[PDB]
């Protein structure tokens, strides 16, 4: 079926590095240089107050839509990732249901400016105060701190490519039918990320990477806050939340 479902040689692991990095460049949504250049474009006091005065449901709908836009690029990344399409449809759905949000949160660090603690949202950079109308402050500050700790690692685009590939191909996700096939794909992607870090003298970041439970805590926080919003405005979720967002975070 696929070469990376078996034990790969050094040269094949080298091909995998290049393959993962190509897949990511083609699906990274926004180019890094565009995000970096736009760092000077920050929302004014007036604009921040405008977002803060928006109704809770209005802000929830905008954030869910933007998050769905990013997730779509992650689905495209998985489709182009070596071996993912060779897995069964059950296992592809399992991996994306559990990992799409985690990949988006990793990818988000590119759009985060550590210097002034701002994130890129709807054309400009804004601090966490911009999201106050959502009424989920703990979760917003948890995403900002996570973006901050990743930003401190000074990830290259190639590093994000290889790390996110590994975030997606997790053989420990509950519900995987072909666990051994996934285990082997993960082991080769692991070798590819660690080979690239070795080749770029970047192995010092391995101990500095966040624990797996941290990304899981952020996804659990997001699902818990959505359920709270759902009880308050159920028809907002039912009529105006994107169908892909509902399929991943509420259950269809």
């Amino acid at each position: 079926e696929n070469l990376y479902f078996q034990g790969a040689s050094l040269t094949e692991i080298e091909h995998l590095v290049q393959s993962v990095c190509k897949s990511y460049r083609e699906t990274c949504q926004l180019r890094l240089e565009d995000l970096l250049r736009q760092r000077s474009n920050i929302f004014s006091r007036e604009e921040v107050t405008g977002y803060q005065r928006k109704s809770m449901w209005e802000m929830w709908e905008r954030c869910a839509h933007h998050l769905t836009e990013a997730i779509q690029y992650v689905v495209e990344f998985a489709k182009r990732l070596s071996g993912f399409m060779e897995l069964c449809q059950n296992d592809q759905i399992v991996l994306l249901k559990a990992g799409a949000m985690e990949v988006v949160l990793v990818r988000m660090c590119r759009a985060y400016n550590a210097d002034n603690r701002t994130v890129f949202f709807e054309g400009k950079y804004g601090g966490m105060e911009l999201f106050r109308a959502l009424g989920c402050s703990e979760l917003i500050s948890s995403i900002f701190d996570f973006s901050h700790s990743l930003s401190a690692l000074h990830f290259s685009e190639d590093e994000i490519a290889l790390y996110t590939a590994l975030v997606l191909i997790n053989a420990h996700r509950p519900g995987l039918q072909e666990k051994r096939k996934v285990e082997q794909l993960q082991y080769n992607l692991e070798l590819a990320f660690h080979h690239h870090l070795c080749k770029t003298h970047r192995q010092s970041i391995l101990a500095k990477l966040p624990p797996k439970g941290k990304l899981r805590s952020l996804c659990s926080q997001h699902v818990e806050r959505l359920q709270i919003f759902q009880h308050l405005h159920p028809i907002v979720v039912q009529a105006a939340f994107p169908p892909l967002y509902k399929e991943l975070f509420s259950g269809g």
């Binding site: 779509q72 689905v75 489709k79 449809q89 592809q92 759905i93 994306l96 249901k97 169908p243 892909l244 399929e247 991943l248 269809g252």
Partner: peptide, 10 residues
């Protein structure tokens, strides 16, 4: 529904 469709659309 949506995820199955995205994965099938080549």
């Amino acid at each position: 529904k949506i995820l199955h469709r995205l994965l099938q659309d080549s």
